[PDB]
């Protein structure tokens, strides 16, 4: 029956931003399929005071069209909170506020189908046939994959017994963790430090042991200096994508400090808190680096975790009743892409050889990939501050026209000669 | 010549320009704006290097009334190809030259502005306000929105003073002359004076002049910018402040000076650090004096003879300076062109415009609207860029009868009235 | 046995005088403290609370950085100097500063704890100080350092119930958080710290939280560096020489210079209000320009009659908890009754403190720590000027200037 | 006359040793310095330049806060203590620290300025130190503190023209701004301060400003407090015990821990670029990943051959002015030639500095200040660990501890 211009699979910030940007475009009509009954953005990490790491301009539309009615500032105006935000004079919205803002934006759009899980994608008669778990079938000429990056746990914890959790479900399991006699957090990303700051603040009223163990060499901060922020730019992606595949993969091993790590102010608040608590006596906490969790066993409601200090070359074990795996996220190719696997391009490492224009299929403009492209677009791939730019390039290729102006240079420095 | 507009805006500063930007998509409103200068220009004499706004960029021409408006600072940055650079800069306060460039950019997009037009006479006839220009043109409108700003103020001691002294509003144009002199004296301790002092103190070793900073103020007090005090820049505080007695309001205007005047706290601290840095190499020939009012001045032998009095201590003293920079502020004066319609304007017991809560100054309560110059009725919000959109939205509401842009009634956590 | 001086009270100002006078052998002093050990406003030991002056304003440093009683040498001895080095924060925590003073007073032998002064007499060119236990000390000079007791409004004198002055907040916090409603009177630094503490857990206990003050705004502590130059020797020289009526009118105008709120705490309070208001309306009220004029206690509930002094309207507030954060005030200690004929007073009844911090007819017999805002402006209760004042006292007691006393420190001139 | 030790060189580390050993009567030391007086990188005395470590990292404070040679006591003597207190900045200006170090050296009795060491011999179980003037000193121990001389790329060895290393920038600034083009090579803190200085006057002189660096990014100095805990005694113990190949790999991947740009300075450079770009296109280039491989001089211009080592592309830059901010490197001094057999080397040819900072076969005869990143990681050139290493050196010299040597300062653990 009906054949749309494109189907959006998943409705996270990137595909929702595409939905807000394509809604006023008449000659371009797409639909978005989302498994959840409504938008929801990492609710398990809705800690008190938690905020974005990027300014409010990295919302769904502003960096492409500040006049769009779905901007964060327009959302604050409708809620009667714009003047209060003006006085707050903070660039970073709280996560619970950004999540409510996204739900508010998705509710203004009619191109979204909530409660719809894509289970099969087929290519028939020059059309992509999308089938959902409820049996509904959609057809279109292009696809925009925005399924995000699911949680990642070390394989040493796959099949582990007990009540251990990934950080993506921390808030729902907080009441149980604070009742235990010991808690161990694995990892040292931003989520680990937030949870560590959270549990360390109440370490007196509960009396547990708090262990923070990570494989990284240091609790390194997020490199947020402005000359480095210029690498989140179109001209750098131009230079980075043209590099040989071996150079891009070697860079990704050394560029994790540019988009991961801990907020510098959070590290300093954690030290200040440690200093404050230690005035009343020794604090029952441990912080270890260069230690990789290699195996874990459960018994009597207690975990025996085996680490190896890879730098020192020594093994040690830690016993703890609570286990929070703040081990990050990792993309895996969705199973619904199996019938069209022969139409998708791959690189010499088994991952999608994403084009400069964010395409992953043989035609070069049929299947578009949101996120999951660090090996081809560097730190800009999961960046909320580049979602409107990427959606601009996707709109430009889908439409042929540059509906939203796409900047070619933004940086004072040059990366290529 | 046969047209009757809904209103005529007199003067095109940031407040009336914001009204122009906000009424442009309103078809039921027919406005026209008359500006003396050939183009927009915003205190160009204070375009010192690095100088920036005291209010975040959301206090632009439209955003607090309509973030979706095409005349916002963010949309302007997007069009200039600078939006991502400002994103990385991560600074709420635009440069002054940047804000000026943005306002000229927005005025160029409108069709309702007549530049090079100086209003000389306003008359009332046939239930219409007749506005004559210096070129002889005549515009008729049902309403008026007055936005002529606040001209410079100099003390009575300097009226009819000889020499090359300057008010701070002409500093950038006279800077290359001032740095040649043997001594410079700054009078006043507002934000303008401190910016000039820092600029001249930064080059004190390159030019070898004495640098005097003398103020009538009791201290170099900072701009009170803490957030609970910022909540007084709100509509609910205006509701409270406006309905206070006239004597109470005039007393608060004398005491609320540190709320919207004074110096940025960061600038005061950077001044001290620079004094500390320069003092390492030897005595810095600079004087910082407070509680001292300039009572008399004369220009003889090519130099100035300033007579001060330390009002708190009660002792007179003199300062000799070849340069004189009066950073003594601005003050509104009733424009001459309103003379033929003073019978239709409402005044308080002090002789100033008894500006209504809805920003009207005429007898009907909705014919002549006043931008700025309303501190005695609207407190610190009167010259605040962060309340221009709010005032214009109330003005638009009185012109239409309907609230085109939503007008917030409460924004603050605290309460001011019981 | 007759000493050179007897110090009455052992707060930070007399303790600093103790550490500064220990190496001076030509001075014999003794200090009498009522309490068993040193304790500094322990009722305000809120979590994270810190000083409002940098650590260089400790007991000795601004007079002698080499003294062994410095905060830095204290940290060195506690194995915490390097951690403090990484902390890179000028402001010690309040519990830390209390522990530091306790560590310093207790390294000295000139302090007699558990000793309350009851009467002071002048008998043949000597000051004779008798204690509550009957013992008697004689000295040629006296150094009064008894501090400033809490102040409560007249509307609360003889008030029934369990209300507290903020100076006893830490002890009574467990019971206040049980109540259905809490009202804070005042808007100083103590009131805002308590408000921030109670607002942080307003969801946990679900009480209504009121913050009503007589101040016109929640004005911040004016802390910019050019204003800090008024905490200088040259400003006291200028301020003390002003006419007494000028000084008294100035004290009403310089409240924001030392009796406000830390600007960052004000901003933290607004952000917490903004944060909690996302979930729903926060049951809190913040009112200004309101004076507490009468209070009554009925069935564990307080009825507080307020008047908005600017608007001119009365209003009431019902609250089960009442925290008076209404500041402190110096009262003439009754043990000075026999020597009142030797003390100099001004036209308003307060001690006419000389520039050299003396309050007796000889200009060098009785010295007053603190309680001198009307003569020395904001420098009187300032920990940053405790070492300067003590070196001037030592200068009078010695005849020679032991510790170098700065004459000018500021870039600006206050006097012409 | 045979002393207990001879100090060779008088930089901050050996000057600190001199202040810490002055009150030790059981120790007889002497220090020999080539300069007529103390001078600390005066070629980098740009206006506003400050230390990157707090003032507690002075000559003595972290070992003995009571020492009369502390920065705070220097400020007291200069009548500048209160103004510094108002300044409330942890970082002294470089001109200030240089004046303070000169002040401390003039108070001491153990320094011979204008004395260059030309030879070191070992005979009769003593070290023989011969100066260029022919004077001969004997002592049981030696402490080497000759610093790290400038390093320039070998592509600039024997280069013609008026090019300079950044060590001499202030002396050549007047002539640099007259040229039509200036190129800075490298991206440490030195290069960034120079770029900011020249960019600030780019509208006054009309040169083109080039900033090219082999570094992959203009990375900031990692200064967050959990990383600062790696500058600690416990991290040195863990680090030194690691295998030698592991230590040499860490020195390559820890340049951002002490050899970056101050984060505030990066953001200021970007803001200045934003500001000046408002008026028009600013004539400046910033390039990374580019190594300088060849350089030749023509008339009064330089032709520089660069290679972007990542993109794999050669390019050239035409520049009249050349400023090499390429860092510093320790080379073994020639005066150690006769005693090389008594020194210990590792597999790479560098000194195998022990945990107690010794480099001689006896493990306690010759100590090395600085020049030990491969053995003590980022603490080796750090002013914040100068008093600690000097306290250990004094412990080895005196046989036991004189100043308290902390065993643990951090909250985290590095060894398991
Ligand atoms: C706690 C946290 C905070 C972060 N903060 C920031 C920040 O401040 N700035 C920044 O730049 N980055 C940030 N990131 C990184 C990144 O921007 C986010 O992870 C972001 O959510 C990624 O957007 P996405 O749409 O690609 O993924 P997601 O938000 O995970 O979108 C995936 C969506 O697709 C749906 N879906 C999945 N499979 C199917 C299917 N088969 N059919 C239909 N729907 C499906 C899912 O239900 C989900 O709604 C943060 C990440 C985390 C975890
Ligand atoms: C240097 C400086 C910086 C400031 N920065 C800020 C800030 O960051 N934030 C803030 O909130 N406030 C700020 N202010 C205060 C205030 O917002 C400004 O003074 C602002 O320019 C006032 O706008 P206005 O339109 O009322 O006056 P103006 O900008 O002065 O507008 C008056 C205009 O009307 C024209 N005009 C006058 N008479 C006539 C006539 N008869 N016919 C025709 N045209 C006429 C004039 O030519 C002029 O263009 C600043 C003030 C100064 C001086
Ligand atoms: C919570 C709080 C925090 C403050 N923080 C700062 C700050 O950071 N910086 C600053 O500059 N100022 C600060 N102040 C203000 C002021 O410096 C302090 O109040 C300071 O404690 C005053 O010192 P004092 O010795 O004069 O008074 P106190 O510290 O009160 O000393 C009085 C002492 O004398 C004893 N005493 C009283 N009567 C007798 C008697 N008859 N016989 C014997 N002993 C007696 C008392 O038991 C007590 O020990 C703060 C005040 C408060 C309340
Ligand atoms: N709005 C916000 O503030 C916010 C909040 C959360 C996340 N984010 C962003 O989301 C992204 C991910 O953040 P994240 O903190 O959730 O995850 P993350 O940054 O990827 O951190 C994962 C941590 O787990 C460690 N790890 C992995 N496997 C391990 C093993 N076997 N044993 C021990 N440690 C192991 C990793 O060490 P290695 O270093 O060796 O890999 C790493 O330290 C980042 O880009 C972040 O900026 C932002
Ligand atoms: N965006 C920006 O950065 C910026 C720049 C400039 C201005 N502004 C704002 O514009 C407004 C005016 O600023 P402004 O600094 O130009 O003026 P101002 O704040 O009014 O300062 C005037 C100074 O001159 C003093 N003075 C007046 N008459 C005197 C006399 N006879 N003798 C000695 N001193 C005398 C005044 O002392 P008294 O205190 O006794 O009156 C006062 O200190 C302010 O609200 C300001 O915030 C903002
Ligand atoms: N280490 C620290 O950070 C720290 C902590 C606490 C205190 N301090 C210092 O200790 C001193 C005292 O602090 P504080 O906050 O406890 O006292 P405070 O500064 O004197 O504040 C007292 C408050 O109570 C108000 N008040 C007085 N009588 C009232 C009445 N009848 N009705 C309503 N309100 C009334 C006052 O309003 P009015 O303005 O009208 O008088 C004032 O707002 C200050 O100098 C402070 O800087 C420092
Ligand atoms: N307190 C202060 O303000 C201050 C001031 C100056 C210095 N310092 C400290 O002194 C130490 C040295 O600082 P520094 O800035 O003088 O030097 P530096 O940190 O060692 O920086 C040297 C720069 O020159 C580059 N380089 C070397 N050879 C090159 C070549 N052939 N071609 C291109 N680039 C080349 C290096 O690239 P690579 O990255 O590949 O090596 C590096 O970027 C640091 O620890 C610093 O913290 C402190």
Author numbering:
A (entry chain D): 9 to 425
B (entry chain A): 8 to 425
C (entry chain C), D (entry chain B): 10 to 425
What do the authors of the reporting publication say about this deposited model?
Herein, we report the first structural and kinetic characterization of a novel alkyl diamine N-hydroxylase DesB from Streptomyces sviceus (SsDesB). This enzyme catalyzes the first committed step in the biosynthesis of desferrioxamine B, a clinical drug used to treat iron overload disorders. Using the electron donor NADPH and molecular oxygen, NMOs catalyze the first committed step in hydroxamate siderophore biosynthesis by oxidizing a primary amine in alkyl amines and amino acids, such as lysine and ornithine, to N-hydroxylated products. SsDesB crystallized as a homotetramer with each protomer consisting of two dinucleotide-binding Rossman-fold domains: an FAD-binding domain (red) and an NADPH-binding domain (blue).
The higher resolution 2.37 Å structure of the ternary complex shows that the NADP+ cofactor is held in the active site pocket in an elongated manner via several direct hydrogen bonds to SsDesB and a network of water-mediated hydrogen bonding bridges between SsDesB residues and NADP+. The electron density is well-defined for both the FAD and NADP+ cofactors, including the nicotinamide ring, in all 8 protomers in the asymmetric unit. The nicotinamide ring is held in position by hydrogen bonding interactions between the nicotinamide N7N atom and main chain carbonyl oxygen atom of H59 and the N5 atom of the FAD isoalloxazine ring. The nicotinamide O7N atom participates in water-mediated hydrogen bonding interactions via water 679 to the E202 side chain and H50 main chain carbonyl oxygen atom. The side chain of Q61 also contributes to stabilizing interactions via a hydrogen bond between the side chain OE1 oxygen atom and the O2D ribose oxygen atom. The phosphate moiety of NADP+ is held in place by a salt bridge between the O2X oxygen and the side chain of K264, and the R232 side chain to the O2X and O1X oxygen atoms. In addition, there is a hydrogen bond between the O3X oxygen and the side chain of S224. There are no significant global structural changes observed upon binding of the NADP+ molecule (r.m.s.d. = 0.26 over 2741 aligned atoms). In comparison to the holoenzyme structure, upon NADP+ binding, several structural adjustments are observed among the residues surrounding the NADP+ binding pocket. At the interface of the FAD isoalloxazine ring and NADP+ nicotinamide ring, the side chain of Q61 shifts away from the FAD isoalloxazine to accommodate the binding of the nicotinamide ring of NADP+, which in turn, induces a shift in the rotamer positions of the nearby L230, E231, and Y232 side chains.
